[PDB]
Design a protein around this ligand. Structure first.
Ligand SMILES: CC(=O)N[C@@H]1[C@@H](O)[C@H](O)[C@@H](CO)O[C@H]1O
Ligand SMILES: CC(=O)N[C@@H]1[C@@H](O)[C@H](O)[C@@H](CO)O[C@H]1O
Ligand code: NA
Lengths: 426, 421
């Protein structure tokens, strides 16, 4: 099992505002730059407001521009994954006018909105279905943030409705994807792992869609509470990988670290290269990792305002296309880990779950929680821990299937370090 | 004093979603159709989300597309008025990501947002300043709806802050407009005239900017309470014209009926042509009317969803491009009233106001109110009433300046018909 290595593509010069009038020669250079790092894929992000400005009209020009960006990715030698619904990017919401204010509604429970997102998922897949470089689709970037209790314009949903939303949209394309050789996934931020009462449940990420996605951001309280270059912080992405597997029905389901960056609000810019290198060392020591997709390709121009300041500095390339120090670190990490194979992990911490396989207390596996710290401490001691649920602890078939020979039990104690946002202003 | 006649331009085929990828040959045909009616101007509506996707970046392609649309209006023989901030159109809000949810803010009070709207106003004027067909700008369509308490995502402001917002944005371009021969205006929905407690005040519409704008929509309770083809309904636009003048410092300031339609949620479709004709008859008998701008040019395609159903039928041309019966009525109204000059109105009903010139009770001038009905009843009787405030009533200079020789005082009685949506 060998990891893919890719980059989340932020267009240079105009960011995602480039979709209004893409500068195709710049986008061509951007993607060639990414390929020259040794990346094998990119993840790209069209805007929902431009794709679907009316509930029952999808803009053909927006679809054609997505196709053109995929085409240029292929011409650079990259596989291209497309996120369908943004939705949310870098602290900003892009919600079409037919779901705001006078037309406020929940994308998760309004049947007419669900039908619209279904039409959009089918239109994106159908537009791209003939492209050799089109590698797969994700429903959208961290869509669960819209339903969290923290959201200022929350779209309500209970957990059963979220399950139906995922099943509906994934089920539109899952059969096509498997027959065509493409991937279908969905993406939640870490509230799915950490926030008690959150309507997206851990098993949804680990059982629905073809691969589990995790987005690893140590500004979530981990870097603040333990230190930016602590083992808890450097190992955070590996923790999410191993945590997610506890909730998977498939004992070797791949886990995609679909976004990870070195955020300057907690990690000193001089440490970001080492953070990159050592975070990927830790990821590479987890079996069945689908790939690592760094956030992000290009710095945000300083002309653009209201981003959390660190978001500007996340790029592997600066605004002119020059490689940054983190870019150099990621390039070297790809070369280092192209054929790293991780050995099985055989000591498991046990997460108490209910009869449906859901955590009794997600706060216990959040930064500062008893389960979070049990894993981190076994990790620091060199024991390479994995994670199972209490239900599977009594299932020798799955245990033997994963090669687990030792169990570690701890009680639930909530952590209080978790940050649901990236910046104090939110 | 002669009226201009124009149309609010809704692009055929794709509505304002056309701004994503304008079909310029279709837009050229749209504007040629409008000119063939005998219209002399159009009002057009760029989208804020496309113009200013970041607080400190205005999209040059969006500016250039506005310029191209103005150019084609001129080539069709039309003057083009541009609304800067949409903002709000036909029940939908278009608010950039940097002012919503995690970035929620008030366009009326957040200084950084005010500076962004200032940059956008200057960029629109500067982009269009060399265009012969560019006739003027309005800050945006019914922007006050964002601060109304009825709005589900309200942008708060008190009346003093609204006044400063207007003064700030208008003052950016007012001198340039006067020097270049163009107009600067702002636009509120009728909450400014009717909604007690609303932070936009009547005198703002009648004193700030170069001309008063009124948008006349009888689904506001007038048609429901009196009947869609009652004199109260047919005269509602003329009423807004004459009511607005009471709060104007300038005794001959022009009043622009900048939007008026025959909404099918209260007016039977078979009656809409007569509603058009007779509403304009009443408007044409008010002096100092800048113009009448019908809502709207082209019907919204039935493929588009979530509009109030009546919005689909407001266009003068059908989805196939054929002239509707209301379009024929508007075309004939232009021919009828191109050279109508309204004589002075000399009998005034008096609006009690406080020392700042604000109504003591806006509900009394709202549908169902005593002042609203006193005007409609005098107009129905052929008395051609105008409107002054109680402050005016003890100012012989202004009274003489407007030619007012008779006053009618009426006791305040609140109306209850007003619909804010
Ligand atoms: C409002 C806010 O800051 N949201 C951020 C989001 O932009 C980011 O993608 C995510 C990563 O986990 O973390 C959230 O807290
Ligand atoms: C939410 C809603 O219906 N808003 C409408 C607005 O679209 C219309 O332009 C205006 C005309 O006066 O009346 C408001 O009530
Ligand atoms: Na529960």
């Amino acid at each position: 099992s060998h990891m893919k290595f890719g980059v989340n593509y932020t267009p240079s010069g105009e960011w995602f505002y480039t979709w209004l009038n893409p500068k195709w020669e710049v986008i061509r250079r951007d993607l060639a730059q990414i390929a020259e790092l040794g990346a094998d894929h990119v993840r790209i992000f069209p805007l929902w407001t431009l794709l679907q400005p009316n509930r029952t009209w999808i803009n053909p020009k927006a679809l054609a521009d997505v196709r053109r960006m995929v085409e240029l990715g292929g011409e650079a030698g990259l596989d291209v994954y497309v996120d369908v619904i943004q939705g949310h990017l870098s602290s900003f919401d892009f919600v079409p006018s037919w779901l705001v204010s006078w037309h406020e509604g929940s994308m998760f429970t309004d049947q007419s909105a669900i039908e619209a997102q279904s039409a959009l998922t089918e239109a994106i897949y159908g537009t791209l279905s003939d492209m050799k470089a089109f590698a797969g689709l994700t429903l959208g970037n961290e869509c669960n943030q819209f339903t969290d209790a923290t959201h200022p314009r929350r779209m309500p949903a209970n957990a059963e409705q979220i399950g139906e939303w995922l099943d509906t949209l994934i089920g539109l394309v899952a059969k096509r994807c498997r027959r065509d050789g493409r991937l279908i996934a969905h993406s939640e931020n870490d509230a799915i792992w950490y926030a008690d009462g959150h309507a997206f449940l851990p098993r949804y990420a680990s059982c629905k869609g073809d691969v589990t996605t995790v987005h690893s951001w140590v500004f979530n309280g981990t870097g603040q509470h333990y230190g930016p270059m602590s083992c808890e912080s450097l190992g955070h992405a590996a923790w999410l990988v191993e945590l997610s597997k506890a909730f998977a029905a498939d004992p070797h389901r791949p886990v995609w670290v679909q976004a990870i960056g070195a955020p300057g609000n907690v990690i000193d810019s001089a440490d970001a290269p080492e953070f990159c290198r050592r975070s990927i060392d830790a990821i590479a020591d987890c079996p069945d990792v689908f790939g690592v997709t760094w956030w992000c390709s290009h710095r945000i121009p300083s002309a653009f305002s209201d981003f959390p300041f660190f978001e500007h500095q996340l790029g592997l390339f600066d605004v002119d296309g020059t490689l940054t120090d983190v870019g150099k670190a990621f390039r070297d990490a790809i070369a280092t880990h192209r054929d790293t194979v991780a050995p099985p992990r055989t000591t498991a911490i046990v997460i108490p779950v209910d009869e449906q396989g859901d955590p009794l207390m997600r706060a216990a596996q959040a930064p500062g929680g008893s389960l979070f710290e049990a894993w981190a401490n076994l990790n620091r001691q060199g024991e390479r821990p994995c994670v199972i649920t209490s239900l599977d602890a009594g299932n020798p078939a799955k245990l033997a299937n994963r090669g687990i020979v030792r169990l570690e039990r701890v009680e639930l104690v909530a952590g209080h370090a978790y940050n649901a946002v990236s910046d104090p202003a939110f």
